[PDB]
Design an enzyme around this catalytic site. Structure first.
Site, PDB file in Angstrom:
ATOM      1  N   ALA B  12       0.820  -1.202   0.000  1.00  0.00           N
ATOM      2  CA  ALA B  12       0.000   0.000   0.000  1.00  0.00           C
ATOM      3  C   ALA B  12       0.855   1.254   0.000  1.00  0.00           C
ATOM      4  CB  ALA B  12      -0.925   0.000   1.212  1.00  0.00           C
ATOM      5  N   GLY B 135       2.831  -7.990   6.863  1.00  0.00           N
ATOM      6  CA  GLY B 135       4.057  -7.785   6.126  1.00  0.00           C
ATOM      7  C   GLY B 135       4.819  -6.570   6.617  1.00  0.00           C
ATOM      8  N   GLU B 245       1.085  23.355  15.939  1.00  0.00           N
ATOM      9  CA  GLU B 245      -0.029  24.142  16.450  1.00  0.00           C
ATOM     10  C   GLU B 245      -1.352  23.701  15.836  1.00  0.00           C
ATOM     11  OE1 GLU B 245       1.668  26.729  18.467  1.00  0.00           O
ATOM     12  OE2 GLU B 245      -0.196  26.800  19.625  1.00  0.00           O
TER      13      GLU B 245
HETATM   14  N1  LIG Z   1      -6.200   1.633   0.657  1.00  0.00           N
HETATM   15  C1  LIG Z   1      -5.390   0.895  -0.089  1.00  0.00           C
HETATM   16  N2  LIG Z   1      -4.833  -0.244   0.444  1.00  0.00           N
HETATM   17  C2  LIG Z   1      -4.007  -1.010  -0.295  1.00  0.00           C
HETATM   18  C3  LIG Z   1      -3.712  -0.656  -1.595  1.00  0.00           C
HETATM   19  N3  LIG Z   1      -2.877  -1.580  -2.094  1.00  0.00           N
HETATM   20  C4  LIG Z   1      -2.640  -2.506  -1.140  1.00  0.00           C
HETATM   21  N4  LIG Z   1      -3.345  -2.171  -0.024  1.00  0.00           N
HETATM   22  C5  LIG Z   1      -3.341  -2.893   1.255  1.00  0.00           C
HETATM   23  O1  LIG Z   1      -2.000  -3.234   1.519  1.00  0.00           O
HETATM   24  C6  LIG Z   1      -1.860  -4.539   2.025  1.00  0.00           C
HETATM   25  C7  LIG Z   1      -0.720  -5.191   1.256  1.00  0.00           C
HETATM   26  O2  LIG Z   1       0.444  -5.441   2.017  1.00  0.00           O
HETATM   27  P1  LIG Z   1       1.605  -4.358   2.307  1.00  0.00           P
HETATM   28  O3  LIG Z   1       1.020  -3.289   3.188  1.00  0.00           O
HETATM   29  O4  LIG Z   1       2.297  -3.722   1.102  1.00  0.00           O
HETATM   30  O5  LIG Z   1       2.646  -5.199   3.195  1.00  0.00           O
HETATM   31  P2  LIG Z   1       3.114  -6.659   2.732  1.00  0.00           P
HETATM   32  O6  LIG Z   1       2.300  -7.746   3.374  1.00  0.00           O
HETATM   33  O7  LIG Z   1       4.576  -6.832   3.032  1.00  0.00           O
HETATM   34  O8  LIG Z   1       2.897  -6.650   1.148  1.00  0.00           O
HETATM   35  P3  LIG Z   1       4.152  -6.803   0.172  1.00  0.00           P
HETATM   36  O9  LIG Z   1       5.155  -5.715   0.447  1.00  0.00           O
HETATM   37  O10 LIG Z   1       3.681  -6.716  -1.254  1.00  0.00           O
HETATM   38  O11 LIG Z   1       4.754  -8.157   0.430  1.00  0.00           O
HETATM   39  C8  LIG Z   1      -3.191  -5.223   1.772  1.00  0.00           C
HETATM   40  O12 LIG Z   1      -3.744  -5.652   2.990  1.00  0.00           O
HETATM   41  C9  LIG Z   1      -4.121  -4.184   1.197  1.00  0.00           C
HETATM   42  O13 LIG Z   1      -5.244  -4.087   2.031  1.00  0.00           O
HETATM   43  C10 LIG Z   1      -4.267   0.484  -2.139  1.00  0.00           C
HETATM   44  O14 LIG Z   1      -4.008   0.801  -3.289  1.00  0.00           O
HETATM   45  N5  LIG Z   1      -5.108   1.265  -1.384  1.00  0.00           N
END
Ligand SMILES: Nc1nc2c(ncn2[C@@H]2O[C@H](COP(=O)(O)OP(=O)(O)OP(=O)(O)O)[C@@H](O)[C@H]2O)c(=O)[nH]1
Ligand SMILES: Nc1nc2c(ncn2[C@@H]2O[C@H](COP(=O)(O)CP(=O)(O)OP(=O)(O)O)[C@@H](O)[C@H]2O)c(=O)[nH]1
Ligand SMILES: Nc1nc2c(ncn2[C@@H]2O[C@H](COP(=O)(O)CP(=O)(O)OP(=O)(O)O)[C@@H](O)[C@H]2O)c(=O)[nH]1
Ligand SMILES: Nc1nc2c(ncn2[C@@H]2O[C@H](COP(=O)(O)OP(=O)(O)OP(=O)(O)O)[C@@H](O)[C@H]2O)c(=O)[nH]1
Lengths: 429, 431, 431, 429
Positions: B12, B135, B245
């Protein structure tokens, strides 16, 4: 770049391997000589998950082909992709164990395994960050289940952190082509529980059931059943090689699915499966193919998921999707058969998308169910084994080799504890 | 002065900054090559050649996400020494983000911050961007926010975390890696915004009249909130709403730093002409429970202290007039022990249009940041959801084998339930 | 006046000088023919015909290295009566360069110096170039610099030795031929720099972004340091950093003449635009343990006396202002008994680009020469690594059969350990 | 210019020498008539290491051919390079010693060896700075083991400063074509320790093992094993003749390898060794080919290097290398099998590169290991020799000549002290 060396034990595991790299070399755009003729550069930017390089624009697949009997090596040498593989990788013995497990694991397979791990270590050395091993073999046979479990327990000794996949072909009670199929099957799973990290129990009955009912072919002449198991074999690692809106690695499926370290037995599923020319034009349109995916007919293991509640479910999508239409549809499935999922895992349907579909469609999506109705598979084999082990028939072909007789009662209790473990969560909460 | 860096982490975290930094180039005329054909220095440390370098640290442990940014467009804008990239994805495992793999790449992310925090005369604060969905977004950030609070004590640090949605879900261990990260963000963070992921679909369904929104129709709306929060540091008006502030107009106690964002208007292009988007409807839209950014109803709870952050062609006459209807002549009940109301962050600059074609241009915009006690209903649907999974001890062996003590879940649940008791503690004044 | 000759010993000595004198021809506009199409006289005793003979003598006992320089490009620049050349390599042997074969060709080298030391009105000093990795670089140089300090007592003599790495190694007998060298370079030398060869691979991989650098990619980075050390003798600014001035502006005692060189910036052409290279960034980058030119961590040790030598578009306002950050509010602890700080060597001429395409052009540079006590961990390897070999008496019979007495190793180690005790002696003031 | 006269003693040494100059006359572009037809002048500027000049553009190799067996002179006199050698240099007797050592050293060899030293002193006079003497012979035979060690002890009497090389083909227990092979082997080594300062104990078993396993030829018809030892014979002195980034002479090798003056017995090794048409095009890539170069299969001496820790290792590269990738790989090899090296020699792997590869490749790299597992080469012979010396069989063919019976008991103790000396460092520290 995460790497997956791809072993191919057995004969059937070599029969589905020649149609596995046939999928991927089309998916990355690789000629059968081994070059690159692809158009989009997003293919070529990550091919090192499955390949190497030559001293040119020429790539060679990371494959290790192991079978105790030649001829199947002569098939893939003379097939459509004979000049693709590395000829040093073609490891093959002389005899070929005739559906024996003690032969092929104790006697014959031990004389070959030390020639294999001198090529596993060579392929593990040319990799920067190894992800895991995936070996495709056939349970019930002789050299896919005797050589195969010997190859796993020697690999997991040397690499106790890399992931392990196993696309085993379990026997079916109806379509059986071996009298000692309930002996070689129930011996493998004792050495398959403790070492593999996530298997894929594909049956050969439902693959014959798909090509009649769903796919509606006339004669499934083994270029489809050993092809349809490759389409769900590329579908798991389609997020390692392609950029996605939300992607999942082999560690991600191996951490979202298993709730306990014994429960790694998956029934995969692939969709869309149209007709040859009928349903792909007349009827089927392809958003929300999950209702095809969760069907009892469109499975790979010959078990009924209505007979046992799911534990965790992975739905790896591939098409150019829309994440509301993925997830809102995924909630409607979880609310429809709300008794078909386990209570103490809320919101269990793990999703993952990509951006590049298979060549010839627009959307596609595999499905990897970790049900508890896989206990119906092992209840068939432990029925057929306990029938034959009463009379102790066919034992001089195993006890004649270097294998005891208390090994079977030890291996059968290890299976019956697994079915006792999978039944422990079907009725409890 | 007034520079403010923004670190990103997760699937994300980079995907927001891929579209958040798409917006800031439109808000300063910066080309995709970083070459402007005034005062942008809160987001761009420029060079003498006429270029502009954004002050952001895109991190991820998995290489397949940043390589989308590192190869497509905006590949010349950033700096290759700051796009930190591991090898293993740390797949949904908080211990693989906090103990195993994240321990290796902490010393490169933390080193790149001191190569950016030494170019700052006045440092307003940090702007992290992650998800709580497992993650690196929860595992590596917990190893990062704990790290920055040692080296940078007296410094604000915002947090635009994505909360796991109640019904919509992606991970299976979404409730496991969210109780584990709130032990970090309760102490080390400051004004941790927690937008939801389901609630922006229910804005992109009815308020925005599009259908099937991707993650590009949803990260544009999360980029506009971080625009108008930091629209006080780089424009003019009647602001005085810089991030120190302003954040002492938010928190009544050091444990209640969990506001919710809310943007208005989000009216589509075809519906833009059939409504006079003026400050009466613009302010009243922010208090609709069908217009929040979290799946929670603030009509259930009681607001403590909002912070209305306007921008565009407004005047403080009817701002203070339209507030008094919402202040008194409504049934959105405030808590008793603060009758002063809320801040007002009037700024001159109107918002812009990302050329992807999502929402047409307007003249007014709000980012109200209410510190309501309706976030306690966003955790009782996690306290029950986590304890339902931990009762059978499912998935614990993928954490205790990775370097995490098994008693931490019995500590994180014990902490975050005492927070929910504390968050409901300040909800009543008179007996 | 102000002439300064540079002698070159060994395979390392000529391959540096093949690319060191490649740089001086660009720093004065001199063609490869020696015919310039002001003041180059510190390095080029020109002739009346329009040519320019470089004031260097290339020494190697093996003909296979100089014949590359004698036949390729720059074959008309040098003077053919000065490329001294033996017949036997005597390689990886201290005694075969100090007693057996190097005794023969000393009388041709030392005669050629007096045919160049009689054209210097003001002779600043000698600039040797060798490696400690055996052969002539340690065997013949120990014979040469013992012979030079007899005939030239009151004359400085620099030393750009290539100290052998702890892990990356080429010679098997590499530790034997360095303990036998420091008995020479303690007495006769002056400000003997010792760069390493592994530490450039940790520079030419991350700071400079190229993969697999050859020996032509480290012998250009070693060329720029001998440029900017002697950039004060031939240009303008606020310098006063001639080689006799900074000599006893650096060493506190006659035994602490082992500084380390460090160059900055070394940023590649791809990230030359994404970073403003100003004087606060340039000095703060010059103190990193991941940016020194030897395998040692200066955070472990304590600096005695640095010596920054800037060049290019700097001004002494912010040079002296950016120093006080590094001087006081950092944890790179100086020694207690000298609080004066360090020399500042501002020069006017910007550094140039060798057209091989390695590092793009800049406007600022620094060749800091810290006389830290972290060199005691560079000799902590070879005090142990040689003692691990000499305990079993390995490889001794290739020295005791050549003229070297067997008790010399028991004398050299006894001296070099007392030096390491002396280096750690001046590190403490208070009880 | 350093000079090396090269003495093809024996018959097998003459068989591998006819393929040794065929490499070099290709490597400098010298026609079989003796002229120069090479393109790049960097290979012409130093040919005097291995050649002379006649009264034209016509070079004549510094070679002395010695064999008691005649007729094999007429093979190389009528072969592809019969007009290349100096016909005055062809020294050959009349009889040909029939696998005897006492004949060929005492009786027969002493009536010929004074004609050789009137040529090796004729060739020492036309050399400006002599480097050493190479001589290639077969151990265990009649000529190359009995005339050769007579020739060395006469040369080392006259030149105690010049270096010495000896490419002795040792006997092997599996491929033995001589009943008195364990007699002529153990008599030669006592007169080979004290005089030569670096040998190269290649074997004829592992050469047969390479052409089946690694090279995968069908029939190793002696034009390959006599060629494969010629590639690693040019590879030692490829830095004397070509300008390298970091070059090493023969004096540099013998000062880097032996830690004690009795431990000069090196097992050479050459890599890359592809298949005949497969790996040289498809599979093999040529950075970091040290993984091939350190393997037990790609050795010349038929000994297992895993059975004994290395003392010192010299790897002479040839290709257009990159000195980080040479040295970073060299540290990873030393840290992988860190128990396979001697403790008290730290950082022992000597590197040396050049700039000109062999014609037909891009990179190449020999390897000269001074292992301690060469004691297994001498523990086989001193087992076989001590078996035959009990019965004292085959002794009247040696005591019939001017050789005593106590010479064998003296020569075995001089060998068993060497195996005691090489075992002294395998276990100590
Ligand atoms: N609001 C929003 N959430 C997102 C988006 N893309 C991914 N997510 C959230 O991000 C999570 C994905 O995992 P990450 O936060 O990148 O952490 P991670 O588990 O290490 O994922 P990776 O780095 O790809 O291995 C998911 O649970 C999604 O809910 C987005 O474009 N918008
Ligand atoms: N998926 C496929 N499975 C096959 C195919 N052909 C046979 N089989 C399956 O695999 C089984 C064949 O057994 P094996 O492959 O293990 C042959 P085995 O190793 O036992 O001895 P060998 O014949 O010497 O290789 C058979 O019972 C079927 O269950 C096929 O084409 N595709
Ligand atoms: N490396 C090679 N060795 C060979 C070859 N042919 C024979 N031989 C080896 O050499 C040995 C025999 O060759 P010799 O020169 O020793 C025979 P001898 O010394 O008595 O000289 P002649 O009788 O004149 O041949 C034999 O045992 C083999 O070990 C060959 O082609 N290559
Ligand atoms: N940094 C650096 N070091 C070099 C370079 N070339 C050679 N060396 C060093 O030189 C050392 C070997 O010593 P030599 O320079 O060969 O000294 P030498 O033995 O007298 O030279 P020869 O007698 O010709 O073999 C090695 O340890 C290398 O580290 C170079 O281009 N750059």
């Amino acid at each position: 770049m995460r790497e997956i060396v791809h072993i191919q034990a057995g004969q059937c595991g070599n029969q589905i391997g020649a149609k596995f790299w046939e999928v991927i070399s089309d998916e990355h755009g690789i000629d059968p000589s081994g070059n690159y003729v692809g158009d989009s550069d997003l293919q070529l930017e990550r091919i090192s998950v499955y390949y190497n390089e030559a001293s040119s624009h020429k790539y060679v697949p990371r494959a290790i082909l192991v079978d105790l009997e030649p001829g199947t090596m002569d098939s893939v040498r003379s097939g459509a992709f004979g000049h693709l593989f590395r000829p040093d990788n073609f490891i093959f013995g002389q005899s070929g164990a005739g559906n024996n497990w003690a032969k092929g694991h104790y006697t014959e397979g031990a004389e070959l395994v030390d020639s294999v791990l001198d090529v596993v270590r060579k392929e593990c050395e040319n990799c920067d960050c190894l992800q895991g091993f995936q070996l495709t073999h056939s349970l019930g046979g002789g050299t896919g289940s005797g050589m195969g479990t010997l190859l796993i327990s020697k690999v997991r000794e040397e690499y106790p952190d890399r992931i392990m996949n196993t696309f085993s072909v379990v026997p079916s009670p109806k379509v059986s082509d071996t009298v000692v199929e309930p002996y070689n099957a129930t011996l493998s799973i004792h050495q398959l529980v403790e070492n593999t990290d996530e298997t894929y129990c594909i049956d050969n009955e439902a693959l014959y059931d798909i090509c009649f009912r769903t796919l509606k072919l006339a004669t499934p002449t083994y270029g489809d059943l050993n092809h349809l198991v490759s389409a769900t074999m590329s579908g798991v690692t389609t997020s390692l090689r392609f950029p996605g809106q939300l992607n999942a690695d082999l560690r991600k499926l191996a951490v979202n699915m298993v709730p306990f370290p014994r429960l790694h037995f998956f029934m995969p599923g692939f969709a869309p499966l149209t007709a040859r020319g009928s349903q792909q034009y007349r009827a089927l349109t392809v958003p929300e193919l999950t209702q095809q995916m969760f069907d009892a007919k469109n499975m790979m293991a010959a078990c009924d998921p209505r007979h046992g509640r799911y534990l965790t479910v992975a739905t790896v999508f591939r098409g150019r999707m829309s994440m509301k239409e993925v997830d809102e549809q995924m909630l409607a499935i979880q609310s429809k058969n709300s008794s078909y999922f386990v209570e103490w895992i809320p919101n269990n349907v793990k999703v993952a998308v990509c951006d590049i579909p298979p060549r010839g469609l627009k959307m596609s999506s595999t499905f990897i169910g970790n049900s508890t109705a896989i206990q119906e598979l092992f209840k068939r084999i432990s029925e057929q084994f306990t029938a034959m082990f009463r009379r102790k028939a066919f034992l001089h072909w195993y006890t004649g080799e270097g294998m005891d007789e208390m090994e079977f009662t030890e291996a059968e209790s290890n299976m019956n504890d697994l079915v006792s473990e999978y039944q422990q969560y079907q009725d409890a909460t | 002065m007034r520079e403010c860096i923004s670190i990103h982490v997760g699937q994300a975290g980079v995907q927001i900054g891929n579209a958040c930094w798409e917006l800031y180039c439109l808000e300063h005329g910066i080309q995709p090559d970083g070459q402007m054909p005034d005062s942008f220095n809160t987001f761009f440390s420029e060079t003498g050649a006429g270029k502009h370098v954004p002050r952001a640290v895109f991190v991820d442990l998995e290489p397949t996400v940043i390589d989308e940014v590192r190869t497509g467009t905006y590949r010349q804008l950033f700096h290759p020494e700051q796009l930190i990239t591991g090898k293993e994805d740390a797949a949904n495992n908080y211990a693989r983000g906090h103990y195993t793999i994240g321990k290796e790449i902490i010393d490169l992310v933390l080193d790149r911050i001191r190569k950016l925090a030494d170019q700052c005369t006045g440092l307003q604060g940090f702007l992290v961007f992650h998800s709580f969905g497992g993650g690196t977004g929860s595992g590596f950030t917990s190893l990062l926010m704990e790290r920055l609070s040692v080296d940078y004590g007296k410094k604000s640090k915002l947090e635009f975390s994505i909360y796991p949605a109640p019904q919509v879900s992606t991970a299976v261990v979404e409730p496991y890696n969210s109780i584990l990260t709130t032990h970090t963000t309760l102490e080390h963070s400051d004004c941790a915004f927690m937008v939801d992921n389901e609630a922006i679909y229910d804005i992109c369904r009815r308020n925005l009249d599009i259908e099937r929104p991707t993650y590009t129709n949803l990260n544009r709306l999360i980029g506009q909130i971080v625009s108008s929060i930091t629209a006080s540091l780089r424009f003019d008006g009647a602001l005085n709403v810089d991030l120190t502030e302003f954040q002492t107009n938010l928190v009544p106690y050091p444990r209640i730093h969990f506001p919710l964002a809310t943007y208005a208007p989000v009216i589509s292009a075809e519906k833009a002409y059939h409504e006079q988007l003026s400050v009466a409807e613009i302010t009243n839209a922010c208090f609709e429970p069908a217009n929040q950014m979290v799946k929670c109803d603030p009509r259930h709870g009681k607001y403590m202290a909002c912070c209305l952050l306007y921008r565009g062609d407004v005047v403080p006459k009817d701002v203070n007039a339209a507030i008094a209807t919402i202040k008194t002549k409504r049934t959105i009940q405030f808590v008793d022990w603060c009758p002063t109301g809320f801040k007002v962050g009037i700024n001159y600059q109107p918002p812009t249009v990302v050329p992807g074609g999502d929402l047409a241009k307007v003249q007014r915009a709000v980012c109200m940041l209410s510190n309501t006690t309706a976030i306690a209903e966003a955790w009782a649907r996690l306290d029950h959801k986590f304890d339902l999974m931990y009762a059978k001890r499912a998935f614990v062996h993928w954490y205790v084998g990775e370097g995490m003590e098994e008693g931490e879940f019995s500590e994180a649940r014990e902490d975050m339930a005492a927070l929910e008791k504390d968050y409901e503690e300040v909800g009543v004044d008179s007996v």
